[PDB]
Ligand binder design. Structure first.
Ligand code: HEC
Ligand code: HEC
Ligand code: HEC
Length: 71
């Protein structure tokens, strides 16, 4: 519903999808062409190239934990 809560054992993550729906070439960057559950999105993938990794390269976004993780 615009905001996708990623229940975490170490603080939840408030990620605005409807918001992230843009700022991307033409979507299909994360999904890889196809909606639905993104494979077995693991905790490693998050910090990988499917959450942070992006920003790390996108040069846009927060990389801090408190930025992603919040109580
Ligand atoms: C920045 C990466 C990214 C982009 C770009 C993106 N999404 Fe998502 N999308 C996600 C993530 C992360 C989830 C949550 C997957 C999970 O939690 O299992 C998700 C979940 C979804 C879901 C599952 C239910 C829901 O409503 O969230 C749908 C449907 C979806 N995306 C559609 C799209 C479509 C269609 C596009 C563009 C054509 C798009 N998304 C663009 C990251 C992205
Ligand atoms: C395709 C690369 C990409 C991926 C993957 C991606 N994002 Fe972003 N992120 C961006 C872009 C682009 C912006 C810039 C948004 C702006 O300009 O306001 C951004 C900005 C943000 C911001 C700052 C704006 C805000 O809403 O507070 C947060 C927080 C954020 N991302 C969290 C996440 C989280 C959490 C995930 C993983 C579920 C994620 N992002 C996955 C591209 C990505
Ligand atoms: C760009 C957003 C983002 C940033 C920055 C980030 N994380 Fe994460 N982290 C996530 C997401 C998303 C998950 C998975 C949550 C889910 O989907 O259940 C996660 C999961 C985790 C998990 C495992 C989840 C569990 O099962 O408890 C740990 C540990 C973790 N993060 C530690 C950190 C630490 C430490 C930092 C800072 C040094 C950090 N994270 C910063 C997005 C981020």
């Amino acid at each position: 519903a615009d905001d996708i809560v990623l229940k975490a054992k170490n603080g939840d993550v408030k990620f605005p999808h409807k918001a992230h729906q843009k700022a991307v070439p033409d979507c299909k960057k994360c999904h890889e062409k196809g909606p639905g559950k993104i494979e077995g999105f693991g905790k490693e993938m998050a910090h990988g190239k499917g959450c942070k990794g992006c920003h790390e390269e996108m040069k846009k976004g927060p990389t801090k934990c408190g930025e992603c993780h919040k109580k």
